[PDB]
């Protein structure tokens, strides 16, 4: 198959475990569940890794423990050990420009100021990796953005985000076999 590694973004520690900026982590903890994988700390990859058993080829799951703006250090290390190209990687992140429970998909392109995406583009040497974008909404002024992502959504949007990841979990066969148009048409409904 295609896409060899799936990455979830977040900050480490329990003081960040419930914040919006950890939405990627929330997806991965459930994607691991779908594939019966478990997490082990790999120091050499700077994070927690999991092997996902698939008939067409194993898929690696990674949550970096680098802090967000150093996320690329973990991604580049994993792709280094197992010889994985940028276009064979999917990264799951929070997306302000769409509201809670919306979900959108693209390959490469702009990052919308995300500090994790920034470092991953910096360390892989290109923007050309796949992104699963999870809506978390946005405040009124973007001078407020940093404080917004570092806080709990809670209640309604947490439920809408769980629905978001549930609906994202059904598109993964087409994502991994590589059917961009198919998964993109399923997700944008
Ligand atoms: C000092 C610090 O926390 N910087 C930072 C930079 C960018 C972002 C960001 C952009 S779009 C999104 N969802 N998050 C968050 C935080």
From Swiss-Prot:
Q: What class of enzyme is it?
A: hydrolase
Cite the source lineage. Bacteria, Pseudomonadati, Pseudomonadota, Betaproteobacteria, Neisseriales
Query: Where does the entry annotate site (Stabilizes the basic form of H active site to accept a proton)?
Result: 94
Role? Hydrolyzes ribosome-free peptidyl-tRNAs (with 1 or more amino acids incorporated), which drop off the ribosome during protein synthesis, or as a result of ribosome stalling.
Give the UniProt record's GO annotations in the biological process aspect: protein quality control for misfolded or incompletely synthesized proteins; rescue of stalled ribosome
Q: Where in the cell is it found?
A: Cytoplasm
Return the EC number. 3.1.1.29
A GO CC annotation given for this chain: cytoplasm
Q: What is this protein called?
A: Peptidyl-tRNA hydrolase
Q: Per the record, what are the reactions this protein catalyses?
A: an N-acyl-L-alpha-aminoacyl-tRNA + H2O = an N-acyl-L-amino acid + a tRNA + H(+)
User: Where, by residue number, does tRNA bind?
Assistant: 16, 67, 69, 115
Query: Could you cite one Gene Ontology molecular function of this protein?
Result: tRNA binding
- Which gene carries the instructions for this protein? pth
Q: Where is this site: Discriminates between blocked and unblocked aminoacyl-tRNA?
A: 11
Q: How does it assemble?
A: Monomer.
Task: Note whether RNA-binding occurs among the keywords.
Answer: yes
Identify the catalytic residues. 21
Keyword annotations from UniProtKB, A to Z: Cytoplasm, Hydrolase, RNA-binding, tRNA-binding
Q: What is its main location?
A: cytoplasm
Family the entry assigns: Belongs to the PTH family.
Organism (species): Neisseria gonorrhoeae (strain NCCP11945)
